[PDB]
Enzyme design. Structure first.
Site, mmCIF file in Angstrom:
data_model
loop_
_atom_site.group_PDB
_atom_site.id
_atom_site.type_symbol
_atom_site.label_atom_id
_atom_site.label_comp_id
_atom_site.label_asym_id
_atom_site.label_seq_id
_atom_site.Cartn_x
_atom_site.Cartn_y
_atom_site.Cartn_z
ATOM 1 N N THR I 1 0.721 -1.476 0.295
ATOM 2 C CA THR I 1 0.386 0.034 -0.064
ATOM 3 C C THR I 1 1.209 1.315 -0.048
ATOM 4 O O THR I 1 1.565 1.368 0.728
ATOM 5 C CB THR I 1 -1.081 0.147 0.926
ATOM 6 O OG1 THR I 1 -1.850 -1.076 0.759
ATOM 7 C CG2 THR I 1 -1.803 1.581 1.327
ATOM 8 N N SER I 2 0.762 2.241 -0.943
ATOM 9 C CA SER I 2 1.027 3.775 -0.902
ATOM 10 C C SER I 2 0.501 4.741 -0.667
ATOM 11 O O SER I 2 -0.925 4.541 -1.535
ATOM 12 C CB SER I 2 1.872 3.595 -1.916
ATOM 13 O OG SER I 2 2.804 2.921 -2.022
ATOM 14 N N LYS I 33 -8.446 3.231 -1.897
ATOM 15 C CA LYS I 33 -8.827 3.106 0.200
ATOM 16 C C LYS I 33 -8.756 4.328 0.258
ATOM 17 O O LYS I 33 -8.328 4.630 1.458
ATOM 18 C CB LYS I 33 -6.942 2.690 -0.278
ATOM 19 C CG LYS I 33 -6.473 1.394 -0.776
ATOM 20 C CD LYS I 33 -5.219 1.163 -0.619
ATOM 21 C CE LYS I 33 -4.489 -0.118 -1.303
ATOM 22 N NZ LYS I 33 -3.659 -0.252 -1.019
#
Ligand SMILES: [Mg+2]
Ligand SMILES: [Mg+2]
Ligand SMILES: [Mg+2]
Ligand SMILES: [Mg+2]
Ligand SMILES: [Mg+2]
Ligand SMILES: [Mg+2]
Ligand SMILES: [Mg+2]
EC number: 3.4.25.1
Lengths: 231, 195, 243, 250, 241, 204, 226, 244, 196
Positions: I1-2, I33
């Site tokens: 995840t970023s 997200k």
């Protein structure tokens, strides 16, 4: 009358009769006096015996090294409330390394008494208390009623015939407030004040109870031969 | 504790139980009676974890004695064995289970029949002509499978039992200090005082 | 009848008589007031000197909640203390979850719901106090008044206790004579006067004046007691107007 | 607080009467009339939609309620008490039966559960009895079609046909004349409409009458196809139009 | 006579405490009314600020329960706010559990069930309020559902509540008998508000300034209340025709 | 240590033409030790039959539990419980112990008294239903039973033929399992007669 | 197990294989993995079979009561929210992995849910041991604006990929189509590409082959009158 | 507070009686009469339904006679709803006992338990008692055929023949006159119906106003059968005993 | 995840990748997200998807109820509610959340709540497994009071690199812009950001 069956009922004029009846039990109690200077605070209490074979019922209870009280009314209720004060003084010392302010003790007693005046099944406390102490702001005297009202005073009296002692202290106010650094003179003024409430009997050696707290004086109680000096 | 055996013959049930009590390194006792009378015609022998054995047995005994007084009546051996099974089945899913195995030998006065029930600590119940707990069955069942008859007398039951105990004393590594033998029949419970 | 013997019972005209009897205890108490000014609120109360033996300045009545709210009440003093203790718990739990100090309207409803809850059952008694309270939040100054029924509204000025009628009329003049508003300092002076005026209904005993305030400019939006010189100056201004 | 009423509010009087139950029955007596009739191939339950104001949208107030796909209920007495009982009855059909046996309860046992709830309000601490009588119609495989009445005491009885509320004594006599063991569902609907007209003062049409049946399975109301054994609910509420069609044939 | 003090049956099958709670409902001496447009639901209520020391902006009996649901209350303010807080809690919880906004009619039912309980359980008193819930529901469209101290509720084409509810009710009935439709056939909510105020003026036989009214409007995806100046603009348009 | 293989045992059920069969071995052991050759694993509540394999204490406990529940069902419903309904009750009862389960493998067999339709079902220890048209197996020799049943079974067998098929499936599966055997019983079930047969088999 | 979900023009379709296993053994060759939460909300489950059944029945029961209480048809987001909050609370101990699909007054929906309580949205999804084989097909052939016939085709092709390539999956394909404004159509055994061939031999025995010790009639009837 | 509205359901009167128990017994005296008679070869239970309607579905109706298990039944006099609460509790106790001991519960042990439950409501909890009296008919292998009654006090006693509900004084006198120890079930059936026929407040005794049951070892060989009579079977035994 | 959030002149922008993995398998390549807890208060989630969805749902409920009673909550208040859940249940949670919102008084604000439940108010924040690779790039390229277009470029370039190096990050770059003007959603596909 129709409104005095329990503590959860206002009368049509906004009165609480169970509380007023609790107040009445204090009026039947034996007289006790409290007064203070700027260095010391004193309790004097006339103890009551049952008959000639019996002991004189103790009136004064120590709550901490710097605080204690005298009672008039239901003695078992004084035991409950003084026990609570001992715990609260103790909590303050253990948790905060701090002696409980006399003013804060008064607030805590007020709130404990109040709860017994607003709920079903309970009854109000049937005792009045005079609380003396010496803390970070000097000498203090408090009067507690089981209505929950707590008041800070230079001097006062409660119990049967307390009105005489109370008037005396009201005249003497300017004198006794200045009795600094002389414990014995402050006690004398206390014994003189309580004498304004005696009839039939006088102050004897098993009759009289005195307590004192101040600048360099732990709360200590004098009974028996230790009060002969003041008789 | 260690060896507990049972055999049901024609007219009685015989329970044999070892006498030794061992605290690790020392045999602390050699005359221990590993049994409780639950009612006049019902006997329970037991073995398992220390403390729990006697605690469980006395608890069961108290309960059956309570029932007897309440109803002025002796429960059948089948009924007592079902009560005991339920208690152990409940115990196995407890916080700390009773680690106790039992044999229940009773004479049913209504049917005029001896009955032997084997129950382990899980609450596994079975009715048998003869039974045991632990390793006792491994040494004795081949003898019982050979000689057992359903019409044996009490004396023939005791003789077959002597043979079982002799095989145990020969091939078992631990000294169990002999057995106490008790007979359950129509007249109640008695102890054979030389074995 | 018998409808007035038990709390939470509706009378045939739809009233709760026990609550109305609580109001009688309030009307029997000393006079207390509040004045909403330009950027804050002022609270003041009459303290009856029952005796010489009362230590002056020492039986404080106005109570702080959190750091930005002042509360004063008339009636049964212990009941008022019980209500403020609850208010302090509500303020603490609000600040704990939401971070920001409790806004005044939010705080008003917390006290309101709690006081109203004591009119739902016969196993409790209604509160024998009317409470004037308020302070400064992010949307400005707010003054409220709460009754034994749980009823509350926002106010320009408010008064309760025995001298409530006199105080109200005084408060109404100020609203009429100052549509633009009152300064916090003016409000302190006015508050002292109004308590002195309302003390006629209680003339038997002498009294001791007590004032507090929260002002954006004068106290940084924190509740403070008016003491020393500023108190004396308000006492003097009050003495003049009754003479 | 705490509920400190932990004692019974319904008690026996010297004459053996349970006053609060009798008074609940009086509240039912004042209620609008409702009835039920059992046919050979169905059951019908019916009542009047007595609208409180004409600005009220009375289709939003449902007096005849689905409890399970094969069981329905109607009442006479206090409407709010009925509404909460319907909520509890729908739930208990699941919690104490469907979540155990994987099928809906038979009529008599759901009636039994509702009855028990009503009995407990007559003995438990600090509550009054429910001020309603229910008529519960249903079908199940092994008992066939059935119709039950439940009273404030918790007592219940099976009926061929009955009526409760206001005009029940007259309606029951009307039903005794017309009922036989060979009625087809349409005959019972016709009789229900005739019976109900007697107790109705004003408007008498599809918009003022509420009528439901327990009859054949309705595969069109199932909402899905492909499972042979699932054939749809037997409970069906008649429309305004369907009632009016049968009021010309009256 | 203790059957008069708590919620048990009297010998005629009545609940007097419930009946007396209905009587408390008119203690504020305020009338309210609600109507439906094509796209909106409007509620208006009289506003009376009898004391000059009051801050009039804090005096209100209209509540924003959720984004979509508004509530007007007829009854004393403490019970009104009790009901408002509970309704707000229930609407928020509903959205959390079931993943969609609580419908107006479902909230009304829920609050009606709670009220039913107070009529059956002795330790709880009924609330002395009548609650009118409004929204533009995503399935049912413009919606009015009203609850009372008996635990009764129903949907309305239009409704009125207060001491003079009958005059307003009959006035509204007469209009709908004429128009033969279940709503005000108007595009804009501004005009539906003007209709609502107009028919209250006719029915009560009294005129209103901007400070004499309180107005709430429900549209698709929000409920809002009007300011004094939005109301003034309404009043002006009524007078100029 | 594995609770489902301490005591040993097997159960199998099959459908035929207007009939069902259910069978089990009679062994109960303590791992290697044979304890009882008379431990029947099939029970019946009215006309519904239930076989249970696994931990013997739980077998006995569940029989007592389902006797309890079906007796109350009957008193209330005024009729005997049906196979389909009983199957759901077993599933419900097992799943209520989801995180402290009975270590068993139950099998239901019976004929619906109204439709006359033959019914069988199996469960995992936690209640998951396997409703098979053909056969259900359970126990310490379930792999063996799957092998026998898959090859010996054919649909619509008459009662007397179904008896031979199921008997041979059990017997030969049991003889390839150390913890199964010591006797066997077969129930042949028709809509209004049930016959029970004890089989002769090797006793090792 | 192989399970998929595919959105199309006017609705959504789900599909599954029909094999259930106990380790390497096939317990049931024609399992039904497509469950009904409500008439137009169906779900398919992978993982612990008892948990997928149980959690589906429980939420389905509560959804039905909710629908009755609100007088509204059930929504997929309600089933989703109730499922995920139940599963989250049990911290993955209820081993239910589901694909939830349905139509409601709000439109058509497709979600996936993991045992610990996480959910996801998509136009095409796959779960189970055959999910990678199925997803390879879905990623190859999916496009926007599929027709009903195209989506059924794609869904069953995706299940077939799992049937042929995953040992945990097999036997038949079950499908359920949920189209807006229509009844949901459950197509049990939509495909049947794995029928057993006839055996070489009949294993029916001669009667009397099995040795018997005892026969007896079993009394299944209640205690008799007279 | 709440004390004001408390009736105090569990207090003695100054004569040492329990008000609510006495008043519950008064309620029970208006219930339809129920009779139990014990013979050497079985037990009879007979009871009168309260005033019926032609539209009542009789063949699916139960108001007096209930099955507790296969060996024990009860006849009810009083509040039916109260009875069903207690009946379901007794059904559960019987199954608990069967599960624990693997033997059918002896009749008295069941009776004592239900009676103890009734007793509790008279001593603690502040709730009203159950307005129910039971006649228990059952069999066990210790005492054989047994009859008991219990009432709202939780007191129970054993009987050869007994009645509860309306007109028990008259009924009991009639039973005491004609009952004999060596009597058989078919004779007991006749005595029970004759007694109801004479004590009823109805004009005549017909099948549609009766519930009837026998417990017989007229089940083949050492075993007991309960028979709850159908409406047609009650009609036949009325003719056969010559009452209609 | 970023994930990241960046304050700028007109407010604040949130950015995220769309990849969620189960080991090395990409369970979802188009994940969202960026989750909404209030109209103009959004959050970026990292850690256990079950935990962060549960937390965000609870926060959304808390802020819906706050709004009903007290009006629009501040971004600080939203962060405090997140924190309370993350701190008190730290033993049973694996959640790393960035909270971002727009007020008219306070304008754009960013709070980061890492694993232990501490709170940190920052001009911009980065989190997730892919953030490690862009600490240097983001520290060198961030300026205060950037324009909307500059801030979109900063996030696009930053997450481009995080996706490039982190196997747990990928798919599309989603963004949410929070200003006085409203709420704008942006999306950037691989063929765009891979060529940067
Ligand atoms: Mg064993
Ligand atoms: Mg009530
Ligand atoms: Mg073998
Ligand atoms: Mg061997
Ligand atoms: Mg073997
Ligand atoms: Mg976790
Ligand atoms: Mg990458």
């Amino acid at each position: 009358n129709n409104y005095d069956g329990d503590t959860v009922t206002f009368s049509p004029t906004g009165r609480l009769f169970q509380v007023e009846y609790a107040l009445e039990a204090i009026k039947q109690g034996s007289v006790t006096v409290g007064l203070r200077s700027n260095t010391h605070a004193v309790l004097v209490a006339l103890k009551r015996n049952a008959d000639e074979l019996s002991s004189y019922q103790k009136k004064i209870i120590k709550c901490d090294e710097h605080m204690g009280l005298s009672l008039a009314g239901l003695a078992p209720d004084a035991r409950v409330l003084s026990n609570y004060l001992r715990q609260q003084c103790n909590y303050s010392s253990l948790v905060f390394n701090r002696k409980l302010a006399v003013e804060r003790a008064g607030h805590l007693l007020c709130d404990k008494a109040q709860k017994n005046t607003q709920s079903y099944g309970g009854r109000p406390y049937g005792v009045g208390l005079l609380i003396i102490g010496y803390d970070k702001s000097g000498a203090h005297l408090l009067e507690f009623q089981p209505s929950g009202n707590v008041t800070e005073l230079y001097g006062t009296a409660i119990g049967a015939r307390s009105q005489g002692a109370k008037t005396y202290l009201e005249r003497t106010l300017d004198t006794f407030i200045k009795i600094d650094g002389n414990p014995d003179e402050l006690i004398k003024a206390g014994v003189e004040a309580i004498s304004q409430s005696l009839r039939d009997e006088s102050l004897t050696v098993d009759n009289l109870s005195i307590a004192i707290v101040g600048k360099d004086t732990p709360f200590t109680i004098y009974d028996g031969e230790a009060v002969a000096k003041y008789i | 504790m260690d060896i507990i055996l049972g055999i049901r013959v024609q007219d009685s049930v015989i329970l044999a139980s070892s006498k030794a009590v061992t605290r690790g390194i020392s045999v602390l006792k050699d005359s221990d009676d590993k049994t409780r009378q639950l009612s006049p015609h019902t006997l329970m022998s037991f073995a398992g974890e220390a403390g729990d054995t006697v605690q469980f047995a006395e608890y069961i005994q108290a309960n059956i004695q309570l029932y007897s007084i309440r109803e002025d009546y002796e429960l059948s051996p089948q009924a007592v064995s079902s009560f005991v099974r339920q208690e152990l089945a409940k115990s196995i899913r407890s916080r700390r289970p009773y680690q106790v195995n039992v044999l229940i030998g009773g004479y049913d006065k209504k049917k005029n029949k001896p009955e032997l029930y084997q129950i382990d600590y899980l609450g596994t119940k079975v009715e048998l002509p003869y039974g045991a707990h632990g390793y006792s069955g491994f040494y004795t069942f081949s003898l019982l499978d050979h000689h057992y008859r359903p019409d044996m007398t009490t004396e023939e039951g005791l003789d077959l039992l002597k043979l079982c105990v002799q095989e145990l004393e020969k091939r078992m590594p631990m000294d169990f200090k002999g057995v106490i033998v008790k007979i359950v029949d129509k007249d109640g419970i008695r102890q054979v005082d030389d074995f | 009848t018998g409808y007035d013997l038990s709390n939470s019972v509706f009378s045939p005209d739809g009233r709760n008589f026990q609550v109305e009897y609580a109001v009688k205890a309030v009307e029997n108490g000393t006079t207390s007031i509040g004045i909403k000014c330009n950027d804050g609120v002022v609270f003041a109360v009459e303290k009856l000197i029952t005796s010489k033996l009362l230590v002056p300045q020492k039986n404080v009545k106005i109570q702080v909640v959190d750091r930005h709210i002042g509360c004063v009440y008339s009636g049964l003093i212990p009941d008022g203390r019980h209500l403020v203790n609850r208010g302090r718990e509500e303020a603490a739990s609000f600040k704990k979850l939401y971070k920001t100090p409790i806004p005044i309207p939010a705080f008003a409803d917390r006290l309101g719901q709690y006081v109203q809850a004591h009119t739902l059952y016969n196993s409790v008694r209604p509160f024998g106090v009317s409470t004037i309270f308020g302070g400064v939040d992010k949307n400005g100054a707010h003054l409220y008044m709460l009754e034994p029924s749980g009823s509350y509204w926002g106010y320009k000025g408010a008064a309760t206790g025995k001298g409530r009628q006199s105080a109200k009329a005084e408060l109404e003049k100020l609203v009429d004579h100052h549509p633009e508003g009152l300064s916090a300092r003016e409000a302190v002076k006015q508050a002292a006067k109004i308590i002195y005026l309302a003390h006629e209904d209680n003339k038997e005993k002498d009294f001791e004046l007590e004032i507090s305030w929260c002002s954006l400019s004068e106290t940084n939006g924190l509740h403070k007691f008016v003491k020393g010189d500023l108190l004396q100056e308000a006492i003097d201004f009050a003495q003049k107007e009754i003479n | 607080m705490t509920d400190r009423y932990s004692f019974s509010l319904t008690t026996f009087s010297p004459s053996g009467k349970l006053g609060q139950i009798d008074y609940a029955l009086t509240a039912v007596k004042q209620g609008v009339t409702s009835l039920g009739i059992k046919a050979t191939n169905g059951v019908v339950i019916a009542t009047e939609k007595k609208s409180s104001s004409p600005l009220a949208m009375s289709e939003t107030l449902s007096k005849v309620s689905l409890l399970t796909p094969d069981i329905g209920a109607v009442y006479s007495g206090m409407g709010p008490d009925y509404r909460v009982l319907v909520d509890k009855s729908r739930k208990v059909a699941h919690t104490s039966y469907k979540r155990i046996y994987g099928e809906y309860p038979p009529t008599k046992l759901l009636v039994s559960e509702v009855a028990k709830i009503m009995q407990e309000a007559t003995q438990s601490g600090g509550v009054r009895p429910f001020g309603v009588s229910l008529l519960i119609a249903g079908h199940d495989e092994f008992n066939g079609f059935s119709l039950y009445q439940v009273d404030p005491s918790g007592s219940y009885f099976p009926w061929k046909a009955t009526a409760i509320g206001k005009g029940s004594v007259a309606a029951k006599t009307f039903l005794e004349k017309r009922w036989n063991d060979e009625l087809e569902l349409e005959d019972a609907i016709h009789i229900a409409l005739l019976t109900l007209k007697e107790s109705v003062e004003g408007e008498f049409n599809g918009d003022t009458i509420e009528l439901a049946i327990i009859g054949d399975e309705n595969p069109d109301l199932l909402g899905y196809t492909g499972i042979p054994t699932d054939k749809g609910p037997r409970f069906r509420k008649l429309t305004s139009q369907e009632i009016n069609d049968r009021l010309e044939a009256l | 006579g203790y059957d008069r003090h708590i919620t048990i049956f009297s010998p005629e099958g009545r609940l007097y405490q419930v009946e007396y709670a209905f009587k408390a409902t008119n203690q504020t001496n305020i009338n309210s009314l609600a109507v439906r447009g094509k796209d909106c639901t409007v509620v208006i209520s009289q506003k009376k600020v009898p004391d000059k020391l009051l801050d009039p902006t804090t005096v209100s009996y209209i509540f924003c329960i959720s984004r979509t649901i508004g509530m007007v209350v007829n009854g004393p303010i403490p019970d009104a706010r009790n009901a408002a807080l509970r309704a707000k809690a229930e609407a928020a919880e509903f959205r959390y559990k079931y993943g969609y906004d609580m419908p107006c009619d479902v909230l009304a039912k829920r609050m009606a069930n709670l009220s039913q309980i107070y009529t059956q359980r002795a330790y709880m008193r009924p609330l002395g309020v009548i609650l009118t819930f409004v929204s533009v529901d995503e399935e049912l469209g413009p919606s009015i559902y009203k609850t009372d101290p008996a635990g009764y509720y129903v949907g309305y084409k239009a409704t009125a509540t207060g001491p003079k509810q009958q005059e307003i009710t009959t006035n509204l009935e007469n209009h709908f008998k004429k128009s033969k439709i279940d709503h005000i056939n108007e595009e804009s909510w501004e005009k539906v508000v003007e209709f609502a105020i107009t028919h209250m003026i006719d029915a009560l036989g009294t005129e209103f300034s901007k400070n004499d009214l309180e107005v709430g409007v429900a549209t698709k995806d929000k409920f809002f209340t009007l300011s004094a100046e939005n109301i003034e603009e309404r009043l002006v348009a009524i007078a100029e025709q | 240590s594995d609770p489902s293989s301490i005591n040993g045992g097997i159960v199998v059920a099959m459908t035929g033409k207007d009939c069902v069969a259910i069978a089990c071995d009679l062994r109960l052991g303590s791992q290697s030790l044979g304890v009882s050759n008379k431990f029947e694993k099939i029970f019946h509540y009215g006309h519904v039959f239930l076989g249970i394999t696994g931990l013997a204490t739980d077998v006995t406990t569940l029989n007592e539990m389902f006797r309890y529940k079906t007796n109350l069902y009957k008193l209330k419903e005024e009729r005997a419980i049906e196979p389909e309904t009983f199957t759901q009750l077993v599933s419900s009862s097992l799943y209520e112990r989801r995180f402290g389960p009975y270590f068993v493998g139950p099998v239901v067999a019976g004929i619906n008294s109204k439709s006359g339709k033959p019914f069988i079902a199996g469960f995992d220890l936690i209640g998951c239903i396997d409703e098979a048209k053909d056969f259900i197996v359970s126990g310490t020799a379930s792999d063996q039973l799957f092998g026998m049943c898959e090859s010996l079974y054919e649909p619509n067998l008459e009662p007397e033929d179904l008896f031979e098929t199921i008997s041979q499936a059990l017997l030969n599966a049991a003889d390839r399992d150390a913890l199964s055997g010591w006797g066997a019983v077969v129930y042949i079930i028709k809509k209004d007669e049930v016959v029970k047969r004890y089989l002769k088999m090797r006793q090792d | 197990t192989t399970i998929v979900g595919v959105k199309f023009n006017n609705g959504v379709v789900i599909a599954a294989d029909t094999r259930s296993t106990q380790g390497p053994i096939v317990a049931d060759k024609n399992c039904a993995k497509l469950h009904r939460i409500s008439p137009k909300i169906w779900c398919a489950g992978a993982g612990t079979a008892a948990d997928t059944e149980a959690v589906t029945q429980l939420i389905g029961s509560n959804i039905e009561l909710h629908s009755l209480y609100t007088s509204r048809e059930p929504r997929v987001v309600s089933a989703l929210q109730m499922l995920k909050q139940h599963l989250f609370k049990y911290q993955g101990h209820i081993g239910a992995y589901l694909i939830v699909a349905g139509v409601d007054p709000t439109g058509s929906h497709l979600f996936s849910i993991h045992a610990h309580g996480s959910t996801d949205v998509g136009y095409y999804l796959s779960l189970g041991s055959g999910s990678l084989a199925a997803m390879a097909v879905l990623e190859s052939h999916w496009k926007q604006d599929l027709t009903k016939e195209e989506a059924i085709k794609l869904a069953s092709d995706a299940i077939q990929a799992g049937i042929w390539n995953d040992l945990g999956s097999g036997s038949n394909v079950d499908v359920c189509v949920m189209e807006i404004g229509k009844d949901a159509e459950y197509l049990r055994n939509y495909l049947t590409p794995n029928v057993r061939e006839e055996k070489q031999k009949s294993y029916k025995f001669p009667r009397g082959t099995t040795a018997v010790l005892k026969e007896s009639i079993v009394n299944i009837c209640d205690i008799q009158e007279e | 507070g709440s004390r004001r509205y408390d009736s105090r359901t569990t207090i003695f009167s100054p004569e040492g009686r329990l008000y609510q128990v006495e008043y519950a017994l008064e309620s029970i005296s208006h219930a339809g009469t129920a009779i139990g008679i014990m013979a050497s070869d079985g037990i009879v239970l007979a009871a009168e339904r309260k005033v019926t309607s032609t539209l009542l579905e009789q063949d699916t109706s139960t108001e007096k006679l209930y099955k507790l298990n296969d060996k024990i039944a009860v006849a009810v006099a009083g509040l039916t709803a109260d009875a069903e609460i207690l009946i379901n509790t007794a059904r559960i106790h019987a199954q608990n006992y069967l599960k624990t001991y693997n033997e059918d519960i002896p009749v008295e042990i069941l009776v004592r338990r239900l009676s103890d439950i009734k007793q509790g409501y008279t001593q603690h909890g502040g709730l009203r008692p159950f307005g129910v009296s039971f006649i228990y008919a059952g069999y066990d292998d210790r005492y054989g055929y047994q009859l008991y009654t219990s009432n709202p006090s939780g007191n129970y006693t054993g009987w050869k023949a007994i009645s509860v509900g309306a007109n028990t004084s008259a009924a009991q006198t009639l039973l005491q006159m004609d009952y004999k120890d060596d009597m058989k079930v078919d004779d007991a059936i006749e005595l029970a119906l004759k007694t109801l026929s004479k004590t009823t407040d109805s004009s005549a005794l017909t099948y549609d106003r009766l519930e009837f049951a026998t417990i017989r070892k007229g089940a083949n060989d050492g075993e007991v059968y309960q028979k709850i009579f159908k409406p047609q079977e009650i009609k036949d035994i009325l003719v056969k005993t010559g009452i209609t | 995840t970023s994930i990241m959030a960046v304050t700028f002149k007109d407010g604040v922008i949130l950015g995220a990748d769309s990849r969620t993995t189960t080991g090395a398998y990409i369970a979802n390549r188009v994940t969202d997200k960026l989750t909404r807890v209030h109209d103009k208060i959004w959050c970026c989630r990292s850690g256990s998807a079950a935990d962060t969805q549960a937390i965000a749902d609870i926060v959304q409920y808390h802020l819906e109820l706050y709004t009903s009673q007290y009006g629009t909550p501040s971004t600080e208040t939203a962060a405090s509610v997140f924190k309370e859940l993350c701190y008190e249940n730290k033993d049973n949670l694996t959640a790393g959340i960035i909270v971002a919102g727009y007020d008219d008084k306070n304008k754009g604000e960013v709070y980061t709540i890492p694993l232990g439940g501490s709170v940190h108010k920052l001009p911009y924040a980065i989190a997730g497994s892919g953030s490690t690779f862009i600490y240097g790039y983001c520290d060198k390229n961030f300026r205060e009071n950037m324009s909307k277009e500059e801030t979109v470029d900063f996030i696009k370039h930053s997450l481009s690199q995080a996706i490039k190096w982190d196997g747990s990050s990928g798919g599309v770059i989603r963004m949410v812009v929070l200003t006085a003007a409203g709420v704008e959603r942006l999306i950037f596909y691989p063929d765009e950001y891979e060529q940067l």
